[PDB]
Amino acid sequence: FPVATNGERFPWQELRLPSVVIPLHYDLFVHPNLTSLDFVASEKIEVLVSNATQFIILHSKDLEITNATLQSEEDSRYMKPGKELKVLSYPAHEQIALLVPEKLTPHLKYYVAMDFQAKLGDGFEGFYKSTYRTLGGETRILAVTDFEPTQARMAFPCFDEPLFKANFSIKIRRESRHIALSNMPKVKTIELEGGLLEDHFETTVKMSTYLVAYIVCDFHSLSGFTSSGVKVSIYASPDKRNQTHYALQASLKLLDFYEKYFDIYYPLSKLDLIAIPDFAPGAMENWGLITYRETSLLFDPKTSSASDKLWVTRVIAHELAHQWFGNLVTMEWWNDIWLNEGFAKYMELIAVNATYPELQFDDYFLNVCFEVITKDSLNSSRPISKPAETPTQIQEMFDEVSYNKGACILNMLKDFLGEEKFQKGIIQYLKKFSYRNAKNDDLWSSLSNSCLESDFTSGGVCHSDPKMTSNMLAFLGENAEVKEMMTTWTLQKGIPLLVVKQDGCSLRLQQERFLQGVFQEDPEWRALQERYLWHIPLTYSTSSSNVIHRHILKSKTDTLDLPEKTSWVKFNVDSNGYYIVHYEGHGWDQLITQLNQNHTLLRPKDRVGLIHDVFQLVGAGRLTLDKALDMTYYLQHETSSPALLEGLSYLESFYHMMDRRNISDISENLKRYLLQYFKPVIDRQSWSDKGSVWDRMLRSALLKLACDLNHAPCIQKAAELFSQWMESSGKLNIPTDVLKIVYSVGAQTTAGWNYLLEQYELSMSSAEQNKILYALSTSKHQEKLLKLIELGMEGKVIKTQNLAALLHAIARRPKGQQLAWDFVRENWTHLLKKFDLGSYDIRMIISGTTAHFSSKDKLQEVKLFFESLEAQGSHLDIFQTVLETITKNIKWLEKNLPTLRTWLMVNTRH
Numbered sequence: 028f029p030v031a032t033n034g035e036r037f038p039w040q041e042l043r044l045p046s047v048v049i050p051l052h053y054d055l056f057v058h059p060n061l062t063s064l065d066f067v068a069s070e071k072i073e074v075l076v077s078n079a080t081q082f083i084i085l086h087s088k089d090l091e092i093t094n095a096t097l098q099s100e101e102d103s104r105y106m107k108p109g110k111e112l113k114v115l116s117y118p119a120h121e122q123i124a125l126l127v128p129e130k131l132t133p134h135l136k137y138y139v140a141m142d143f144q145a146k147l148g149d150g151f152e153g154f155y156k157s158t159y160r161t162l163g164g165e166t167r168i169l170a171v172t173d174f175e176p177t178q179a180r181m182a183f184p185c186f187d188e189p190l191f192k193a194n195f196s197i198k199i200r201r202e203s204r205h206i207a208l209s210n211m212p213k214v215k216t217i218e219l220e221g222g223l224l225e226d227h228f229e230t231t232v233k234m235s236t237y238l239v240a241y242i243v244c245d246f247h248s249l250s251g252f253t254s255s256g257v258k259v260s261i262y263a264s265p266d267k268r269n270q271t272h273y274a275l276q277a278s279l280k281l282l283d284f285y286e287k288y289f290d291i292y293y294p295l296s297k298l299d300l301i302a303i304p305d306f307a308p309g310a311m312e313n314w315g316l317i318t319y320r321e322t323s324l325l326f327d328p329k330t331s332s333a334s335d336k337l338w339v340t341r342v343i344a345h346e347l348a349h350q351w352f353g354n355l356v357t358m359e360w361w362n363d364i365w366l367n368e369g370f371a372k373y374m375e376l377i378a379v380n381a382t383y384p385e386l387q388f389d390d391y392f393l394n395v396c397f398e399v400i401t402k403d404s405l406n407s408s409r410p411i412s413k414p415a416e417t418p419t420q421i422q423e424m425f426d427e428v429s430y431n432k433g434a435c436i437l438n439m440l441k442d443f444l445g446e447e448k449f450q451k452g453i454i455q456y457l458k459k460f461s462y463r464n465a466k467n468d469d470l471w472s473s474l475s476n477s478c479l480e481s482d483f484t485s486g487g488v489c490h491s492d493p494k495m496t497s498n499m500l501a502f503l504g505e506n507a508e509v510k511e512m513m514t515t516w517t518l519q520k521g522i523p524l525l526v527v528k529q530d531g532c533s534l535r536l537q538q539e540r541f542l543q544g545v546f547q548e549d550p551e552w553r554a555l556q557e558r559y560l561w562h563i564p565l566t567y568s569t570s571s572s573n574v575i576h577r578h579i580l581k582s583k584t585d586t587l588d589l590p591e592k593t594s595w596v597k598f599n600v601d602s603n604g605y606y607i608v609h610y611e612g613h614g615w616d617q618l619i620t621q622l623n624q625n626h627t628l629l630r631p632k633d634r635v636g637l638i639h640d641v642f643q644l645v646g647a648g649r650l651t652l653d654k655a656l657d658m659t660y661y662l663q664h665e666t667s668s669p670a671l672l673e674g675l676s677y678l679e680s681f682y683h684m685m686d687r688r689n690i691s692d693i694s695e696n697l698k699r700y701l702l703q704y705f706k707p708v709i710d711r712q713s714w715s716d717k718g719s720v721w722d723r724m725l726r727s728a729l730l731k732l733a734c735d736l737n738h739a740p741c742i743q744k745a746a747e748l749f750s751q752w753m754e755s756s757g758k759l760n761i762p763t764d765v766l767k768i769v770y771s772v773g774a775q776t777t778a779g780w781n782y783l784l785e786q787y788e789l790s791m792s793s794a795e796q797n798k799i800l801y802a803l804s805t806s807k808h809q810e811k812l813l814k815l816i817e818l819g820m821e822g823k824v825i826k827t828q829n830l831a832a833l834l835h836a837i838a839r840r841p842k843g844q845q846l847a848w849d850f851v852r853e854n855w856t857h858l859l860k861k862f863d864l865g866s867y868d869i870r871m872i873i874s875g876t877t878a879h880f881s882s883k884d885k886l887q888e889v890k891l892f893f894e895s896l897e898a899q900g901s902h903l904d905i906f907q908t909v910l911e912t913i914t915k916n917i918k919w920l921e922k923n924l925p926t927l928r929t930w931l932m933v934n935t936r937h
């Protein structure tokens with residue numbers, strides 16, 4: 028089939044490279060010029076051929092290839108130096124061919140050199156340009172890589188697949204006012220004739236091309252050493268060095284934890300962490316040199332909040348985890364990308380807990396799971412492992428399914444097997460697959476066949492010579508059943524719904540595929556129920572016993588039998604499992620009255636899980652909005668902030684939902700209910716930074732809710748801070764837990780909104796900037812909102828890396844959803860300039876501007892617009908996902924709007 032760039036048959040037909048030429052080592056020399064804003068470069072690839080061949084296939088993109096040569100030392104036809112090579116392009120596969128004068132030899136090593144050149148990229152991918160503001164008003168330039176998944180090929184030609192691991196030797200030629208960083212430490216610096224310098228770096232360990240990295244910049248650092256002797260450096264532009272302190276501590280402590288828990292030393296002399304001014308993802312896990320958004324890494328007590336400190340701990344923890352789960356062990360291909368991204372997400376939980384339990388990140392994890400259930404309960408969801416091929420289909424694989432769900436599934440497991448067995452299984456996995464790859468099954472066989480104690484040969488279990496007890500019968504047997512289980516969770520899209528009926532001291536269990544916007548008898552429903560079956564490890568506790576009993580489904584139905592009768596049953600203890608529970612008969616009722624009478628009788632995660640499931644079931648039509656709203660009545664005595672905030676979030680979301688649609692009467696009663704109830708808690712609240720972290724997080728949430736509902740004291744107190752701050756011209760300090768609230772109130776007048784846009788450009792805290800841009804985005808004046816979008820498109824005052832977040836900010840407010848939607852449709856083509864397709868930024872631009880729509884009206888416009896984008900060849904998965912979400916909203920209103928109008932009215936009466 029293939030017909031290449033300038034006539035002529037491209038030897039290769041398939042999208043994945045040929046598995047016949049194996050690279051081994053890369054000599055790579057880069058000479059970027061940052062006044063010309065370009066680079067020239069060169070490389071030598073030591074390959075090993077396995078079957079004889081006359082063509083060499085390798086990726087490349089937007090790379091002008093000057094020379095091309097094949098040497099060797101084991102083949103005489105190719106000894107130094109010749110001959111030059113036949114290079115042939117094919118942009119449609121980002122592949123090039125090397126056509127060779129004469130067939131090569133099985134099991135012999137040849138050397139592919141090549142000169143190639145290009146312009147510094149100008150959008151977040153490959154080897155690209157970035158700029159920053161000094162404290163003085165100066166604007167400087169740096170050159171950065173981001174290659175994951177497939178943009179190495181834009182930077183130097185290579186065999187871009189994660190399987191093709193190789194050593195990397197790297198040299199960077201630079202000017203004296205710049206340093207240069209890469210994955211490895213700097214071995215040598217040679218002074219040069221004109222006066223340039225050339226840096227050499229230790230040849231890397233075996234690694235994938237997407238992890239290669241080099242930076243050229245004038246940054247500063249703070250450094251510290253690990254227990255195990257790793258040098259750790261936090262790099263940041265010079266007038267910001269002192270926002271790198273927390274990162275230094277956190278990384279050191281976290282890297283120390285990771286070596287212990289994994290029982291594998293981080294393998295490299297140094298570990299650099301650099302905050303990049305223009306960075307599209309939040310961070311990139313480059314072995315030896317991790318890159319970060321400024322907001323993901325820097326921290327400043329005067330102006331960052333405690334949720335910010337929690338976000339920086341999170342992201343640092345996520346990255347450093349990747350050094351094992353991703354860099355040391357890498358996914359065989361992008362279908363199992365979750366072996367990378369699921370584990371890093373989940374190891375956040377573990378490592379942040381272990382190293383910083385005063386951050387309470389253990390509570391907040393349930394949020395990871397609730398967020399993915401949203402998407403996982405629509406039919407436009409996917410299995411965590413599905414095939415992938417296009418650059419676009421690979422980027423798409425990076426979503427809350429491969430991240431959050433993988434983390435959740437894995438957390439389930441940890442509960443089932445217990446920490447000690449889980450941990451043991453991980454340490455095996457990593458040791459076994461060090462410096463190479465794994466596919467899904469590898470991860471389970473290891474987690475399955477995990478080992479204890481080790482108990483020292485003499486009994487047994489794990490050794491060359493273990494005995495054969497009546498335990499070894501099930502060790503090899505139960506472990507093999509754990510594997511049969513997880514394979515369900517990785518191959519089947521969706522999430523199971525357990526139904527629990529309590530007639531007698533016996534419990535009947537049914538199992539279904541939980542779906543939202545689809546009642547137990549729509550026409551839709553049966554088809555979606557078809558083949559689905561899970562291996563759900565369940566737990567439960569009763570009122571008569573706070574003992575944790577465990578049991579495993581089994582098929583569509585099953586029956587357990589309690590000791591004694593009891594008031595209530597409560598399945599999924601702490602909701603450590605990936606299933607929704609529905610209680611039939613009087614189940615919800617008993618459980619609810621139990622909350623109002625003595626809620627401490629239920630574990631506080633049980634409370635969070637119950638609140639979550641009760642509202643989720645309303646959506647699936649197995650419950651009515653009144654039973655759920657009824658269960659919020661207990662919140663007035665609730666003291667665990669997880670449970671309060673979760674409950675408040677459902678009420679706060681209904682309000683915002685009603686506000687969009689101009690349903691003033693429900694909007695206004697809802698406002699009234701929230702302020703009159705919850706008035707005790709709203710008012711126990713300092714405008715301070717005092718208290719723990721859930722305390723601080725409660726204060727922000729409750730103080731926001733008050734100011735969102737124009738509760739005049741709260742509005743007055745806020746504005747009375749903004750005034751003192753604007754007059755003192757910054758010399759006065761606003762607590763960080765209220766910064767966003769005060770700015771938002773302040774931004775309601777043109778005097779305020781102006782002063783704030785000003786402070787935006789001057790700020791050295793990228794976190795304060797974050798808060799200011801939110802406040803700015805809450806003006807009513809549509810002129811101002813539009814200025815913000817404009818500015819953000821230019822990319823000068825407001826970086827374009829911020830634009831998706833700001834369209835979403837604007838869109839979710841009533842005075843800005845039309846503007847946002849109009850803008851996205853009228854500037855689509857321009858947005859495809861600025862961003863991939865592909866990108867995270869495009870997906871947040873699409874769904875942050877449409878997914879909150881709730882009218883068949885809006886559903887109409889969005890459905891066309893997507894179809895308009897279809898044909899042009901723009902297909903994303905976010906298209907169906909969004910439309911399925913808009914519809915879920917519409918059905919929800921259809922089936923529950925009256926019931927919400929009435930519940931409130933009733934309440935007013937009582």
Ligand SMILES: *[C@@H]1O[C@H](CO)[C@@H](O[C@@H]2O[C@H](CO)[C@@H](O[C@@H]3O[C@H](CO)[C@@H](O)[C@H](O)[C@@H]3O)[C@H](O)[C@H]2NC(C)=O)[C@H](O)[C@H]1NC(C)=O
Nearest residue numbers: 051052193194195196229230231232233234294461462463
């Ligand atoms: C490409 O990376 C591989 C690893 O992925 C490098 O292999 C490593 O280097 C040598 C093997 O030649 C081994 O060195 C060991 O180090 C200690 C001192 O720390 C020394 O005393 C021992 O006697 C031993 O030689 C090391 O075990 C090995 N590691 C692995 C995992 O294979 C290889 O060097 C790299 N290739 C190039 C060209 O740099």
Ligand SMILES: *[C@@H]1O[C@H](CO)[C@@H](O[C@@H]2O[C@H](CO)[C@@H](O)[C@H](O)[C@H]2NC(C)=O)[C@H](O)[C@H]1NC(C)=O
Nearest residue numbers: 058059060061062063200201202221222223224
């Ligand atoms: C990048 O290119 C610029 C010019 O294209 C180089 O700057 C010149 O360097 C020469 C000798 O090194 C000086 O005599 C000139 O005065 C420089 N020009 C200016 C405008 O200052 C620069 O050295 C190159 N850098 C690299 C790393 O290649």
Ligand SMILES: *[C@@H]1O[C@H](CO)[C@@H](O[C@@H]2O[C@H](CO)[C@@H](O)[C@H](O)[C@H]2NC(C)=O)[C@H](O)[C@H]1NC(C)=O
Nearest residue numbers: 376377378379380381384389438441445446447
């Ligand atoms: C988070 O950390 C805490 C404490 O570090 C773990 O909680 C348990 O603490 C008690 C102390 O009385 C002990 O049973 C163990 O240290 C911990 N439990 C177990 C079963 O080992 C908690 O397990 C951690 N959370 C996660 C998800 O690992």
Ligand SMILES: O=C(NO)[C@@H](Cc1ccc(F)cc1)C(=O)NCc1ccccc1
Nearest residue numbers: 175176308309310311312425426427430
């Ligand atoms: O996983 C991460 N670094 O490894 C980054 C994002 C990233 C995206 C694509 C890449 F190729 C590399 C990194 C992250 O935490 N991102 C936030 C996020 C949340 C949910 C889905 C996707 C991203």
Ligand SMILES: *[C@@H]1O[C@H](CO)[C@@H](O)[C@H](O)[C@H]1NC(C)=O
Nearest residue numbers: 045046047077078079080133
């Ligand atoms: C490559 O060689 C192996 C045997 O060494 C065999 O599969 C066949 O001859 C070749 N296969 C391909 C796909 O070229």
Ligand SMILES: *[C@@H]1O[C@H](CO)[C@@H](O)[C@H](O)[C@H]1NC(C)=O
Nearest residue numbers: 069093094095096140141142
């Ligand atoms: C590249 O080709 C030019 C053309 O003559 C030659 O002079 C030069 O030596 C070549 N360089 C490399 C690195 O192959």
Ligand SMILES: *[C@@H]1O[C@H](CO)[C@@H](O)[C@H](O)[C@H]1NC(C)=O
Nearest residue numbers: 267268269270326327328329
């Ligand atoms: C910045 O560094 C200075 C020392 O130059 C230090 O006193 C200060 O605490 C750091 N933080 C800020 C926000 O300036």
Ligand SMILES: *[C@@H]1O[C@H](CO)[C@@H](O)[C@H](O)[C@H]1NC(C)=O
Nearest residue numbers: 405406407408551554555911
């Ligand atoms: C549900 O998903 C499957 C798999 O993508 C698809 O074939 C089917 O058409 C979908 N049905 C509906 C009603 O969305």
Ligand SMILES: *[C@@H]1O[C@H](CO)[C@@H](O)[C@H](O)[C@H]1NC(C)=O
Nearest residue numbers: 623624625626627628629664
């Ligand atoms: C709730 O139950 C516990 C357990 O006995 C008890 O200590 C507490 O006083 C009870 N509170 C109420 C209001 O019943």
Ligand SMILES: *[C@@H]1O[C@H](CO)[C@@H](O)[C@H](O)[C@H]1NC(C)=O
Nearest residue numbers: 686687688689690691841842
């Ligand atoms: C809400 O509806 C009323 C009904 O006439 C209308 O006058 C008002 O402008 C609407 N408000 C918004 C914000 O659309």
Ligand SMILES: [Zn+2]
Nearest residue numbers: 345349368371
């Ligand atoms: Zn990650």
